[PDB]
Structures are given as structure tokens and as C-alpha cells.
């Protein structure tokens, strides 16, 4: 009778606004199950991520509030669009479960990677990827965790980014947070990261796309390393002496490698026939991959370098490339710790604005 209602989705409950029905589930985010739904009002498909008592943990609470804010202040046609927050409870006293209502993209990379793409399509998808990426970068924010399962595309060939539990400014300042395969060496071998970490992923993601399968697979966090330098090759001494001794000892001990050339890494037999006039050459995407799939974090390409790059610039629209960073009210910063309870407030606090 009141504002809400529940539905039994498996061993989960969604209590949500009557206005949203017909919930299938769709996946888990960083820390919430997410559900597809009908918006009665808007008469349009949505996503609903529920996060169960996020305040239970310095993990949860932190990397949840993040999303909250981030989601809100975020403003770019390549990030998934927030459409609503809420909680059913009466007050801080009662409070626990949050819900986040978002746009429902048709699909996600996993099975784009599946079909064989025309250069243009491939390129475009990348293009956009980066432009979105550019966005948070332009605000000091780093996704930290981009993957197929995180990129969503629409049947017109629009493409967006998801889930912001992970996103923050540089470090280190958190071990096995990020997804195994798309871990960049500066992470694999925890040295601490900077924003062109995201570029690496894009590389694998793109690679994967072209490749047909995961680029650097790897059965366990440690076996990853090998896979990287199998294909890419044992990094320089100059790189090495930056690792922590404890770690390097091992790395150096790992047998030496040339690795392949990107061409053999990614032969044409995989690419489609080519464009009208160049820019969209196989060699050129290789040349991209080449500047992103670089073991050295410091000897790597930027995004504005990635958008300058020939294979990408063909669609270059500065009103997509260089719009304003979002504004984070700086009372929040992605680092500082709080209390067992302090958090419960912040959220309810931050939720109460939004709803």
C-alpha cells in the first residue's frame, strides 16, 4: 500500500518502487546484484543495482559511496547514466539497502568480441571507449577496472562504461581488487599505479577483440606475469630496478624473453580487409596496440596520445574529446578512512540528497 514493494529474485529480495516491475536479474557489479526492470513511469528499460548493507565494511562503504558520487557528478555520453537512487527504510536508524537505477544498454563486450568487426566499427567502439576514459581522467579519476564485462554497447553502435567501486585518483594507496587478465604490470607486481594504467586494459580489450580471446590469460595471479612477458617479452633492466627488491628477485629469475612482434602477436588473418584511404590500416591498429601494450608503465601512450593516434582521430570530435571534467565536491576524496558508523551516515547522507 505504501511507496514500495518486494519481489523474490532467487535468494535475494528487491524492495523497490512500484513504478519499477518485471525484474529479471542481469549480473553482479563490484558488490551488488543488478537487475533489469520496467519503468512504469518512464516506460523504458532500466538497470537496478542493489547493494546490501554497504556500510557493513570499510571495503563496501568506501567503494560504494564512490559509485554514488561518481555516478552523480559524472557527465558524458560514454558512461552509463544514473536515473535514480533510493532506499526503502525510514531513517539512519532503520537504514541499510541502496538501489541505483541506470540505463539499460542492449549488451556488452563479451560477445562483441565474438563477431568479426569491420575496422570502422572496431575503431569506433575503441574511439568511444577512450573518450569516456578521457572523461574521468580529465577529473583525476581512474577506472582501475575496465573489461568486456564492463563495457556496454547499443544496437546503433553507441558504447558505455560501468561500475565505479574501483575508480579513484593515483596511488598506491588494495591487492587483488582488479580483474586478473587486464592487470597491468605496475599492478601485477604491485609497484603503484598512474592513470595510463587504464590504457593497458584498452590494449587487452582491443587485443581480445581482434584476438578472439583473452590476450594475456593466466591461471593464477603469478602465472599472469609470465603470459604477459611470454607474448610481450622480458622488460628492460631499466624497468626492473624500479620493482621492489623482494619482488624483482623473482622477476629477474623468470627466464628471459624476446616476446613476439605485434605483427606475429596479431596477424592479419584476424583483421578484416581494409578501409578506403588508410588511417584504418591493420598496421595502424597494430601500431596502436603497440603503444598501449607496453610492459613499462612509464614508457606508455596517453589517451590524448591515443586519440591523436591515426586509427582513432578519424572520428575526432572535440565536443566529445574535450568537454568539461565533472565536478566532484572536494569534501570527498577517494582515500580517507572513517568509522564503523561514520560511513552509514555519509551514504544515507549522500543518498538523501540524490533522492
Amino acid at each position: 500500500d505504501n511507496n514500495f514493494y518486494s519481489v523474490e529474485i532467487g535468494d535475494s529480495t528487491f524492495t523497490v518502487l512500484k513504478r519499477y516491475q518485471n525484474l529479471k536479474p542481469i549480473g553482479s557489479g563490484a558488490q551488488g546484484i543488478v537487475c533489469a526492470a520496467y519503468d512504469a513511469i518512464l516506460e523504458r528499460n532500466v538497470a537496478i543495482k542493489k547493494l546490501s548493507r554497504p556500510f557493513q565494511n570499510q571495503t563496501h562503504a568506501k567503494r560504494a559511496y564512490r559509485e554514488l558520487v561518481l555516478m552523480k557528478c559524472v557527465n558524458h555520453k560514454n558512461i552509463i547514466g544514473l536515473l535514480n537512487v533510493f532506499t526503502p527504510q525510514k531513517s539512519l536508524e532503520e537504514f541499510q539497502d541502496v538501489y541505483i537505477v541506470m540505463e539499460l544498454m542492449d549488451a556488452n563486450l563479451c560477445q562483441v568480441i565474438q563477431m568479426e568487426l569491420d575496422h570502422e566499427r572496431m575503431s569506433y567502439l575503441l574511439y568511444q571507449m577512450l573518450c569516456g576514459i578521457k572523461h574521468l581522467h580529465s577529473a583525476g579519476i581512474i577506472h582501475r577496472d575496465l573489461k568486456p564485462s564492463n563495457i556496454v554497447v547499443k544496437s546503433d553502435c553507441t558504447l558505455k562504461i560501468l561500475d565505479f567501486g574501483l575508480a579513484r585518483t593515483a596511488g598506491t594507496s588494495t591487492p587483488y581488487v582488479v580483474t586478473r587478465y587486464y592487470r597491468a604490470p605496475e599492478v601485477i607486481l604491485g609497484m603503484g599505479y598512474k592513470e595510463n594504467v587504464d590504457i593497458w586494459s584498452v590494449g587487452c580489450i582491443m587485443g581480445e577483440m581482434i584476438k578472439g580471446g583473452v590476450l594475456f590469460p593466466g591461471t593464477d595471479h603469478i602465472d599472469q606475469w609470465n603470459k604477459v612477458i611470454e607474448q610481450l617479452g622480458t622488460p628492460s633492466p631499466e624497468f626492473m630496478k624500479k620493482l621492489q627488491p623482494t619482488v624483482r628477485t623473482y622477476v629477474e629469475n623468470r627466464p628471459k624473453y624476446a616476446g613476439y612482434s605485434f605483427e606475429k602477436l596479431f596477424p592479419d588473418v584476424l583483421f578484416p580487409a581494409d578501409s578506403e584511404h588508410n588511417k584504418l590500416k591493420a598496421s595502424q591498429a597494430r601500431d596502436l596496440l603497440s603503444k598501449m601494450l607496453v610492459i613499462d608503465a612509464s614508457k606508455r601512450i596517453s589517451v590524448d596520445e591515443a586519440l591523436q593516434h591515426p586509427y582513432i582521430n578519424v572520428w575526432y570530435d572535440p565536443s566529445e574529446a574535450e568537454a568539461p571534467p565533472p565536478k566532484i565536491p572536494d569534501k570527498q576524496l577517494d582515500e580517507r578512512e572513517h568509522t564503523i558508523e561514520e560511513w552509514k551516515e555519509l551514504i544515507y547522507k549522500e543518498v538523501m540528497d540524490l533522492e
Binding site: 542492449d106 549488451a107 560477445q111 562483441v112 563477431m115 569491420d118 570502422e120 566499427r121 569506433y124 554497447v153 547499443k154 544496437s155 546503433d156 553502435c157 578501409s275 578506403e276 588511417k279 584504418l280 578519424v314 572520428w315
Partner: peptide
């Protein structure tokens, strides 16, 4: 060089 407006997820 025109941006594409379809994507197939068959």
C-alpha cells in the same frame, strides 16, 4: 568516413 549507426548482436 561515416560513423556507423548499427551494431549486430544477432
Amino acid at each position: 568516413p561515416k560513423r556507423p549507426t548499427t551494431l549486430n548482436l544477432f
